[PDB]
Amino acid sequence: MRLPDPYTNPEYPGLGFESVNLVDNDAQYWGINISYPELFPDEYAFLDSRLLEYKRTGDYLDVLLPQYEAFRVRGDTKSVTIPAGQKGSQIILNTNGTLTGQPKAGDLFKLSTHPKVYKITNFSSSGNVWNISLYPDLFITTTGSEKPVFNGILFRTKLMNGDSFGSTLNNNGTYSGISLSLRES
Ligand SMILES: [Cl-]
Ligand code: NA
């Protein structure tokens, strides 16, 4: 299930995060700490209903972190190839001349076929050959059918603080201190 935000639900601008911390837990997994601004009753009720549905159905929570949305690499990834049999800390790909721009160390990365999110540690190229160094090491050996993902990356997580989720209506008619602690699953 997608954690609702102002992109899925622009009617609730309060679902836009105030602060986000991406924590490295070293298999390696990312921890995500999200802090909300004060939420209006409709926003809080909608978020609460969506987290109750997540609790009811033992699903994951997919989350977009807009602070990593730099759109540094653009274009159609259809003819972009990732050769099979790769594992370790590097992903080599052939852009086929279809991608504009280049990624930077600190950017996120994901393979289209697997949920793991990586951090880019280094980038080098030789024409259409891109060499992207990743942290942590690849969770799978490539099959050759994967596509690189630079934008719109969703982290697949589980909620860690469901037992301390919630708030009470304050004197301003809003809900303060709402925060989500997520663990990449
Ligand atoms: Cl592997
Ligand atoms: Na949100």
Domains of the chain, by residue range, sit at 1-66+154-185, 67-153
The values of phi and psi at residue 41, to 5°, are: -55, -45
The Å distance, Cα 3 to ligand 2 centre, comes to 6
Contacts of 111 (CB under 8 A, 6+ apart): 82, 91, 138, 140, 142, 146, 147, 148, 149
Q: Determine contact, residues 118/137, Cβ cutoff 8 Å.
A: no
Which secondary-structure segment (H or E) carries 48? Answer: helix 41-56
> For residue 103, how far is its CA from the centre of ligand 2 (angstroms)?
26
The CA dihedral of 157, 163, 169, 174, to the nearest 10 degrees, is -20
19 contact partners, CB below 8 Å, separation of at least 6: 33, 34, 35
For 67-153, the fitting CATH number among 2.60.120.10, 3.40.50.1860, 2.40.30.290, 3.40.120.10 is 2.40.30.290
The alpha carbon of 33 and the centre of ligand 2 are apart by a number of angstroms equal to 12
- Closest ligand to residue 61's CA: 2
Closest CA to 150 of 103, 81, 90, 94: 103
Going from the C-alpha of 88 to that of each of 24, 58, 136, 149, 179, the distances in angstroms are 18, 32, 9, 18, 35
CATH level 2 (architecture), domain 1-66+154-185: 2-Layer Sandwich (3.30)
Q: What is the DSSP letter of 116?
A: -
Length of the chain: 185
- Residue pair 41/175 in contact (Cβ under 8 Å)? The answer is yes
Q: Give the distance (Å) from ligand 1 centre to CA of residue 141.
A: 4
